[PDB]
């Protein structure tokens, strides 16, 4: 079977510049017919691949021209001449020449990019969900750069890290800022017995955390 | 335009078999190979195999040749995998793919189908809203199984802006939550609604964002 190596793994590039993805397979990948068919796909977070190059070196109807693949024998290579945020994914290398079709295990596009504070907002359990027996408080610290970042939440001034959750989203395709959200998730009866409540963003482009809060009354 | 329509969601006993399908338009059913794939969440891709639906002659991977089996019906353009015996090693999304001839074997993917074997009951999610010169609004989707939920804002015409945050797992219910941000000149003179869409339980929820009093 045709094993199918991918270097590097992940690869961190700035806006603008050169990226270059090598594949190189165990043994060679000729089909009977004379045709390589070596291709390169590219998924997206959230989304199923899409094809990028065809038979080593053929862009893909609509795939844009800054990507070029080359190589031959058992070495093949995949350029980005010029990254941008929408590039954002896992690219793969795969051999349909011999049965069974192989793909090699995924190289990682990071984007890196100058620094950004995060946009918090803070969001009351809704009136729905206390109907229902529950309150959650929702925090969502957007838009920021890099990946690190602590919330704190508060409630009447007092630390609290039980029932908090916590998600990242991938780097986003326009920005390449990440964003995250956090929620803590208490019963009525205990948000109803406390009054203020605290979102706390630290993050590595300033000293001072960003604070946001609100009171149970009004 | 080419499409491989592939349910969202499958939920399935341990033990248990599923059958998934791979409905084709576009183009002749009959004309094109089509490829089946497994990927594991956040995982890289496997190779299961693939059938020709005009002769309906198939080609396995051999880790799959006891777990996987290939058909199609041309009258209904459609493709099946059905999967036997299922294990959570079997929980994956798996896509299928459309061959474009002697060229490659993706050319069109469909959105694929994710596969949760587990003996737990599907839970539909609650839908809550979440209300406060540029506006940031939300939807906490709470307590459901099995992944995934799909949102948008206004039916995908608020499209910029968005942050979908992967859903976490806890007490065995998955939790997920949207922000949307608008001029604040949109909102709340215009109304902005969240759909969820939880495809394991059919369920469509159309959730507008209020001010709060």
């Known amino acids: 079977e045709l094993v199918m190596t991918q270097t590097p793994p992940s690869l961190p590039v700035s806006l603008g510049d050169q990226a270059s993805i090598s594949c190189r397979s165990s043994?060679?990948?000729?089909?009977?017919?004379?045709?390589?068919?070596l291709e390169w796909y590219l998924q997206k977070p959230g989304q199923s691949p899409k094809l990028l190059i065809y038979?080593?070196?053929n862009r893909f109807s609509g795939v844009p021209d800054r990507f070029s693949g080359s190589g031959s024998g058992t070495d093949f290579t995949l350029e980005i001449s010029r990254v941008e945020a929408e590039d954002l994914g896992v690219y793969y290398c795969?051999?349909?020449?011999?049965?069974?079709?192989?793909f090699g295990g995924g190289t990682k596009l990071e984007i890196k990019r100058a620094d950004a504070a995060p946009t918090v907002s803070i969001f009351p359990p809704s009136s729905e969900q206390l109907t229902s027996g529950g309150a959650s408080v929702v925090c969502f610290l957007n838009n920021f750069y890099p990946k690190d970042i602590n919330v704190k939440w508060k409630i009447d001034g007092s630390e609290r890290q039980n029932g908090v959750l916590n998600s990242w989203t991938d780097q986003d395709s326009k920005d390449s800022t990440y964003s995250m959200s956090s929620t803590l998730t208490l019963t009525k009866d205990e948000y109803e017995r406390h009054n203020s409540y605290t979102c706390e963003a630290t993050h590595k482009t300033s000293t001072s955390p960003i604070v946001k809060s609100f009171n149970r009354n009004e | 335009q080419v499409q491989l329509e592939q349910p969202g969601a499958e939920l399935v006993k341990p033990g248990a078999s599923v059958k998934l399908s791979c409905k084709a338009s576009?183009?002749?059913?009959?004309?094109?190979?089509i490829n089946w794939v497994k990927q594991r969440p956040g995982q890289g891709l496997e190779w299961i195999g693939h059938?020709?639906?005009?002769?309906?002659?198939?080609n396995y991977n051999e880790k799959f040749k006891s777990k996987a089996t290939l058909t199609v019906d041309t009258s209904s353009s459609t493709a099946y995998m059905q999967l036997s015996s299922l294990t959570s090693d079997d929980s994956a999304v798996y896509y299928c793919?459309?061959?474009?001839?002697?060229?490659?074997?993706?050319?069109?993917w469909g959105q694929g189908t994710l596969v949760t074997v587990s003996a737990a009951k599907t839970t539909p999610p609650s839908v809550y809203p979440l209300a406060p010169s540029m506006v940031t609004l939300g939807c906490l989707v709470k307590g459901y199984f099995p992944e995934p939920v799909t949102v948008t804002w206004n039916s995908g015409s608020l499209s910029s802006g968005v942050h979908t945050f992967p859903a976490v797992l806890q007490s065995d219910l998955y939790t997920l939550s949207s922000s949307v941000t608008v001029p604040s000149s949109t909102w709340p003179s215009q109304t902005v609604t969240c759909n969820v869409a939880h495809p394991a339980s059919s369920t469509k929820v159309d959730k507008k964002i209020v001010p709060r009093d």
């Open positions: 038979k080593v070196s």
């Open positions: 059938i020709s639906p005009g002769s309906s002659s198939t």
């Open positions: 043994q060679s990948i000729v089909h009977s017919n004379g045709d390589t068919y």
């Open positions: 795969f051999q349909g020449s011999h049965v069974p079709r192989t």
């Open positions: 793919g459309r061959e474009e001839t002697v060229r490659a074997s993706f050319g069109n």
């Open positions: 576009g183009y002749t059913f009959t004309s094109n190979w």
